[PDB]
């Protein structure tokens, strides 16, 4: 006789019939039985021992929920609300939000707490957190129209006072509440309905989750999953624009395409699938080829090989750029593709001078001047960059090692 | 009812081991599949975790004692271990994890 029961012993058969009529939703029996019963009691007596309102909301009966919500003696009403938001029933949620005691905000002690203690959904979760947690758009919209905004996670390192108070004797549930609210702000429903524009808040919150993934050693997988969900929200939002006006509002926002820092910020924060999209790739090619369209439409990379072979000769382009700017070749020489073909080509003639120096004074001086040009290019490169940023790339090291060995 | 014992002949177990044979092992692994499931484990006893561990190692022993049906005893013991893991996973407070 070790079995556990919610009620000590099954008591009333009449109240048990009331519960069996509230479970399967027999409205006339509970309507006729509302008035003529001795008292309307919280029945429980189940495996989970839910109330009649709770048991009726679990199964979606709107008429018996409306009938019970007028009894005024009910309990667990808030717990029934979090349950109905979990199940995703909109009619029941709006019928409960108009109940008494729910005027103004009730959101954000002795509330919910079904069966005398030990409520569900972690006891730190308010209605809106569970609403955006389940991706319920209508319910999130109704709760936001009533003015329930999610609280901020606060800060990880900041002790403050109440955060330090809840860090001792409450511990290990503090991180659970942190990642719970963070799962709250990170979902498409709250991101789209909450703010003025989604994309800015989504990017900023994405890099913040990326920082708090590394700051906290535990739960790093989960923070990774939330940040990735956010990045996918942004990618999915840019994917849905069918016109150039909308793609320019998503990419740039408020000399080609001036004031483009948002893509710069997107590659700074390492959003992978935002910059790889076909629309964004089309934009960046439009800025990448720029003044020269003829090669943008060119047939094969072999024509680009002949183009890099004809760009190999310095004297024409260098003499032009030095003596006069802003010619036709002056407008062309300023461009994203031309600096690339010229830089790469001159690298190839450096290799060629290496091979011809090896096969059999002048080659010496030329190669020396070339590695001096490389070390000056690394002067201008390391100028703008802090020692840590310069050393971030493994290859950015090996390059300096190469030119240094040449100097030695 | 309990599975009784594999090696013990007793009287009624020996009576059902002859002329009833090959259905005796079927009844054994059938009842063992009975005690091994989350419903009976959670509702049956005072605490689930102790009975689940003890029954898990007992199924691990009877997997090696009996050469046949070793795969199925392995599956039942693994189902039990997963019941315990799933039960420890659901505690949201330090008091409950302790």
């Amino acid at each position: 006789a070790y079995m556990f029961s919610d009620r000590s012993t099954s008591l009333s058969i009449e109240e048990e019939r009331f519960l069996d009529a509230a479970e399967y939703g027999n409205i006339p029996v509970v309507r006729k039985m509302l008035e003529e019963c001795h008292s309307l009691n919280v029945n429980c007596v189940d495996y989970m021992g839910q109330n009649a309102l709770q048991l009726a909301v679990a199964n979606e009966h709107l008429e018996i929920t409306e009938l019970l919500l007028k009894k005024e003696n009910l309990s667990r009403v808030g717990d029934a609300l979090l349950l109905a938001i979990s199940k995703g029933y909109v009619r029941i949620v709006e019928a409960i939000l108009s109940h008494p005691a729910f005027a103004e905000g009730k959101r954000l002690d002795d509330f919910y707490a079904y069966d005398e203690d030990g409520t569900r959904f972690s006891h730190d979760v308010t209605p809106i957190i569970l609403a955006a947690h389940c991706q319920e758009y209508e319910i999130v919209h109704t709760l936001l129209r009533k003015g329930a905004r999610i609280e901020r996670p606060h800060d990880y390192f900041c002790k403050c006072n109440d955060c330090n108070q809840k860090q001792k004797h409450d511990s290990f549930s503090h991180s659970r509440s942190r990642i719970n609210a963070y799962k709250g702000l990170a979902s498409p429903a709250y991101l789209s309905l909450s703010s003025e524009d989604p994309v800015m808040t989504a990017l900023e919150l994405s890099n913040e989750l990326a920082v708090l993934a590394n700051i906290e050693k535990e739960f790093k997988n989960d923070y990774k999953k939330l940040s990735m969900q956010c990045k996918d929200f942004v990618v999915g939002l840019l994917d849905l624009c069918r016109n150039t006006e909308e793609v320019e509002a998503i990419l740039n926002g408020d000399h080609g395409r001036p004031n483009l820092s948002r893509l710069k910020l997107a590659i700074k924060y390492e959003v992978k699938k935002f910059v790889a999209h076909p629309n964004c790739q089309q934009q960046l090619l439009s800025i990448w080829y720029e003044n020269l369209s003829g090669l943008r439409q060119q047939t094969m990379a072999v024509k680009f090989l002949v183009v890099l072979a004809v760009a190999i000769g310095l004297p024409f382009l260098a003499l032009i750029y030095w003596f006069a700017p802003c010619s036709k070749m002056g407008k062309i020489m300023r461009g994203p593709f031309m600096k690339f073909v010229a830089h790469a080509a001159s690298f190839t003639i450096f290799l060629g001078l290496l091979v011809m120096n090896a096969a059999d004074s002048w080659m010496e001086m030329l190669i020396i001047s070339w590695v001096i040009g490389m070390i000056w290019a690394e002067c201008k490169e390391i100028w703008t960059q802090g020692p840590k940023e310069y050393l971030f790339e493994l290859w950015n090291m090996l390059d300096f090692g190469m030119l240094a060995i040449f100097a030695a | 009812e309990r599975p009784h014992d594999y090696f013990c002949k007793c009287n009624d177990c020996n009576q059902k081991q002859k002329h009833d044979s090959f259905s005796h092992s079927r009844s054994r692994i059938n009842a063992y599949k009975g005690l091994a499931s989350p419903a009976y484990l959670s509702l049956s006893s005072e605490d689930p975790v102790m009975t689940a561990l003890e029954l898990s190692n007992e199924l691990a022993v009877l997997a090696n004692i009996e050469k046949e049906f070793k795969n199925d005893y392995k599956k039942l013991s693994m189902q039990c271990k997963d019941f315990v893991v799933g039960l420890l996973d659901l505690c949201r407070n330090t008091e409950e994890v302790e």
């Binding site: 556990f4 989970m48 | 959670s42 509702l43 605490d47 659901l90 505690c91």
Partner: peptide, 30 residues
């Protein structure tokens, strides 16, 4: 005592969670 109460809370959570997990999986033509 406290231990028994905690066991009741854990068993209740596990039963309800198990019924939700049963709900979440597909359909039966029957």
């Amino acid at each position: 005592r406290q231990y028994q109460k905690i066991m009741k809370r854990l068993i209740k959570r596990y039963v309800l969670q198990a019924q939700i997990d049963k709900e979440s999986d597909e359909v039966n033509e029957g």
